[PDB]
Design a protein around this ligand. Structure first.
Ligand SMILES: [Cl-]
Ligand SMILES: [Cl-]
Lengths: 273, 308
């Protein structure tokens, strides 16, 4: 009997305290088998509740809400192909472009085309005044989805034919490159036997027998597989990372028989935390 | 503490594992200056950084025997009437010697209404019984029970009669010899809604404390200190960590029910100090694949420590 048997014993003591605590009982109901014979109804609802004992979510990895893609590195602009994205998971897709500040007030003709051999997606007419450059966002949700089930040209010319759109950024144009802003809606264990030589954090078998405790106030289940965790972690602590409930039919010691769901009574998985 | 020197290493591995990155993206501050857009969406994402009771059991069915002329039912707790899904009164009619008709009558006992009466009709049944065995009869009493749970009434008294063709009562109310578990009872099915306590407590002692018990200690994860410039935001966050001894606690029944506590100042492999509640963090980062990603990383902050 090593540290593992000390973990098995303390698990049995924990289950005993947990059962009364979770069932809101200060003490184990003082009801003998002789009293249960008189009070337990010999009726279909009890037989049914007793006969029942004869018979997915990724919460670890991160969830990507927004993806911002810069153009791949002369020609412009081609976008990424590495990240996996769904056709119907796209909530919003906007192409952001920066227009350089103008020396004199002019009209700006913005033209975005999807390359194949050329199909128009959006055309804008802007009025720009001297002072500062401006960020223009273009809805590309329909196009972004169309390419997911399988190159963007950007032009922003003023009245003189000069292109104001920053595609390949010149000196002092840091963080002014075009980009796609895409918003999306996207959301085991180790088991051992009692005599395992395994030193790592592991799940071991444990059957809890309420008749062995003398807890006759519990009608069903008379026994259940509770399991326990034991092993070295090198968090530095072998604990359950997944637990499941049990249904219990019991005498509450207040002239009542209750059927209920007790959470976290069975160890499903062990881990280091 | 060495538990902090190992928690920092765990956070580093967790961040890359949860973000599905084999290695930390190799992007310098010089490259970040060129690629990070000085645009409204990036300004909106960066500017953002400036309990349901899962412990106690759920009650699904309550079976109540009559309180110890028949029959009175006393509930240990009067549940909200709208939580009642089903309420049935179960009655046992004794086996008959010859085949007869049974007139079953269940009445609610009310306070005398002077001119009215002292008894209210719930249900009336007619059934044909043949020799061989007794049967169990269930009577719908949901309306009566819900009205009682919503009323400023103390007790629920129900009169039960089940007479055959000779006037003999077949219903078991007060069980005679060999009639164990044949008494009348209420079967009530409920939808127990878990009442949250709204957590705001837990042992979160300071770093200079001499506390030996399982405790939550402060820990700030500075990504600039790691040289992880690929993380745009947050540049710093409070992750915290658990440390401390967990004593053995045993249930004892004599002379009265109580808990016995025992020290665990060594590695005796009993209970262990671990996080019992954790929270996520939102991260704006360069994935190293020409993309900037905003996401939610779960279980990055230790909120509460406990013994397990
Ligand atoms: Cl056992
Ligand atoms: Cl209802």
């Amino acid at each position: 009997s090593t540290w593992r048997q000390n973990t098995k014993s303390s698990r049995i003591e924990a289950i005993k305290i947990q059962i009364l605590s979770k069932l809101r009982l200060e003490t184990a109901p003082n009801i003998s088998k002789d009293v249960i014979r008189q009070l337990l109804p010999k009726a279909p609802p009890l037989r049914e509740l007793i006969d029942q004992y004869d018979v997915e979510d990724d919460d670890y990895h991160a969830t990507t809400e927004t993806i911002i893609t810069m153009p791949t590195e002369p020609k412009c602009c081609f976008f990424k192909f590495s990240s996996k994205i769904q056709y119907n998971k796209v909530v919003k897709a906007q192409l952001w472009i920066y227009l350089r500040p103008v020396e004199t007030p002019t009209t700006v003709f913005v033209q975005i085309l999807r390359l194949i051999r050329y199909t128009g997606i959006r055309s804008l007419k802007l009025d720009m005044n001297p002072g500062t450059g401006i960020w223009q966002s273009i809805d590309v949700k329909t196009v972004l989805q169309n390419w997911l089930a399988a190159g963007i040209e950007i032009k922003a010319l003023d009245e003189n034919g000069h292109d104001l759109a920053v595609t390949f950024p010149g000196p002092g144009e840091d963080g002014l490159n075009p980009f796609l802003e895409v918003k999306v809606t996207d959301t085991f264990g180790l088991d051992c036997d009692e005599h395992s030589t395994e030193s790592r954090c592991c799940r071991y078998p444990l059957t809890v027998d309420f008749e062995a405790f003398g807890w006759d106030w519990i009608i069903a289940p008379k026994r259940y597989k509770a399991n326990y965790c034991s092993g070295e972690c090198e968090g530095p602590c072998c604990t359950p990372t997944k637990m499941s409930p049990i249904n219990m039919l019991y005498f509450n010691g207040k002239e009542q028989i209750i059927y209920g769901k007790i959470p976290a009574m069975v160890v499903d998985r062990c881990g280091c935390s």
